[PDB]
Amino acid sequence: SGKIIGIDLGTTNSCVAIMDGTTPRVLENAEGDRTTPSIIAYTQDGETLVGQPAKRQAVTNPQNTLFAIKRLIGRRFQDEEVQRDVSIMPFKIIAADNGDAWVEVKGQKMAPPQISAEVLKKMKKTAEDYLGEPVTEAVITVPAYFNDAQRQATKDAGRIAGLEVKRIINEPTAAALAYGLDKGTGNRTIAVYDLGGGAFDISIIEIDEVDGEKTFEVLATNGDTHLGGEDFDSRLINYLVEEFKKDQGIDLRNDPLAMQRLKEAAEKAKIELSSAQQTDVNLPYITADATGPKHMNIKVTRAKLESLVEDLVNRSIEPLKVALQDAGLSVSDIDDVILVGGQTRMPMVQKKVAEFFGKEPRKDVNPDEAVAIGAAVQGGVLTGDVKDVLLLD
Numbered sequence: 001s002g003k004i005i006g007i008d009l010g011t012t013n014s015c016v017a018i019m020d021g022t023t024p025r026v027l028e029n030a031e032g033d034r035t036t037p038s039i040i041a042y043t044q045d046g047e048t049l050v051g052q053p054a055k056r057q058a059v060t061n062p063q064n065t066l067f068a069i070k071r072l073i074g075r076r077f078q079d080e081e082v083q084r085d086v087s088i089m090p091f092k093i094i095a096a097d098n099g100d101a102w103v104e105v106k107g108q109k110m111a112p113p114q115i116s117a118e119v120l121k122k123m124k125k126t127a128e129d130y131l132g133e134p135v136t137e138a139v140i141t142v143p144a145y146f147n148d149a150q151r152q153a154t155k156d157a158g159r160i161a162g163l164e165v166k167r168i169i170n171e172p173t174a175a176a177l178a179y180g181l182d183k184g185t186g187n188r189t190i191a192v193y194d195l196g197g198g199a200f201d202i203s204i205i206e207i208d209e210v211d212g213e214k215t216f217e218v219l220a221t222n223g224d225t226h227l228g229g230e231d232f233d234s235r236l237i238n239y240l241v242e243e244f245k246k247d248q249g250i251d252l253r254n255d256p257l258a259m260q261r262l263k264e265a266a267e268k269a270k271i272e273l274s275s276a277q278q279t280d281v282n283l284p285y286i287t288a289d290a291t292g293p294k295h296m297n298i299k300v301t302r303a304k305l306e307s308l309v310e311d312l313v314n315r316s317i318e319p320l321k322v323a324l325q326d327a328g329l330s331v332s333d334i335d336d337v338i339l340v341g342g343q344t345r346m347p348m349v350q351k352k353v354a355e356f357f358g359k360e361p362r363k364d365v366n367p368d369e370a371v372a373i374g375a376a377v378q379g380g381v382l383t384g385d386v387k388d389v390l391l392l393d
């Protein structure tokens with residue numbers, strides 16, 4: 001009964017959408033925001049916080065504020081990704097008795113789906129508050145590269161949240177369904193360039209209209225699972241650490257609190273530089289010793305940021321070339337390019353993509369919302385708010 005909600009369960013941010021007839025709507029959460037940080041905190045007084053309230057208390061509760069769980073879900077403890085993360089994450093990653101990668105909080109061992117379920121519960125409650133009725137059914141997205149274990153673990157997170165998971169849909173296909181509502185009629189071949197907080201994906205997708213059905217077919221996919229916005233942040237963090245050392249002679253990498261503050265400040269400055277030519281990073285009392293307190297104040301220009309991440313943006317191009325080769329297409333066979341993911345808002349990324357294809361990406365696809373909207377469209381196809389759509393093998 002009710003609506004089948006569409007959920008984008010992201011590395012960095014999650015969001016929820018519904019179909020109101022032919023019109024998708026992305027829903028704002030209890031904090032008023034159309035996206036929710038994928039952050040789950042277990043507080044000293046026993047509450048579970050999700051989203052911005054969790055983000056806001058991370059500095060004072062670092063061992064019990066969980067994030068980036070999408071990097072662990074469905075994985076084995078000795079997976080190379082997991083082993084890297086054990087060393088860098090401030091929370092405790094452990095081996096379950098069966099060999100899976102788990103987390104431990106205040107002595108309680110938890111599987112990754114038990115943590116991502118808290119985000120899904122917030123998406124469910126958001127939709128219930130908006131609609132005035134219970135929500136029990138959902139479509140949840142996953143990256144195209146996810147394996148069976150990762151897909152099943154995501155389905156399990158939905159069940160833990162009290163949702164019947166009607167379908168798992170791949171993120172590029174969801175973006176294509178969002179585009180396909182307001183697209184030109186007939187045959188179209190699109191390139192979906194998705195640069196999120198954790199991973200990069202390029203998919204070539206063909207849309208057709210035949211025998212009264214709109215068909216969608218993935219012609220090729222490629223990507224880099226170690227290329228995401230968090231890597232852009234890391235380059236800026238490293239610059240700030242190096243500049244502070246050069247100027248003040250102190251290495252902040254030894255101080256976890258300082259490094260947590262730098263991570264937040266670096267991400268804020270990076271986002272600011274998508275619309276400004278320069279910005280300033282100010283962190284009072286970033287460290288202190290017997291000589292006195294030290295305050296960081298560093299100007300970062302857009303040119304400097306571009307130089308720090310140029311090679312990351314360039315790493316996204318070779319997969320583009322291979323995906324076209326695999327699809328048997330040249331760049332002149334692509335009708336539209338769709339940017340998906342918050343990190344595509346960087347002007348340098350937009351310019352490099354346009355230069356590669358020789359045409360500007362579509363402006364009427366919101367890179368932050370397309371995946372959630374596509375999940376909602378799939379939910380409409382299952383009910384009947386949306387008719388005549390077929391996903392081809």
Ligand SMILES: Nc1ncnc2c1ncn2[C@@H]1O[C@H](COP(=O)(O)OP(=O)(O)OP(=O)(O)O)[C@@H](O)[C@H]1O
Pocket residue numbers: 009010011012013014070195196197198199200228229230267270271274340341342343344345346367368
């Ligand atoms: N205006 C902006 N300019 C540059 N980067 C941005 C901007 N807005 C958001 N970002 C970055 O986008 C990333 C988040 O993108 P998004 O929400 O698409 O990821 P996600 O869907 O959670 O990740 P994934 O698809 O990898 O699971 C973060 O690294 C964030 O700092």
Ligand SMILES: [K+]
Pocket residue numbers: 008009010011012013014015368
């Ligand atoms: K997202």
Ligand SMILES: [Mg+2]
Pocket residue numbers: 010011171196197341371
């Ligand atoms: Mg995403």
Ligand code: NA
Pocket residue numbers: 194195196197198199200201341
């Ligand atoms: Na992505």
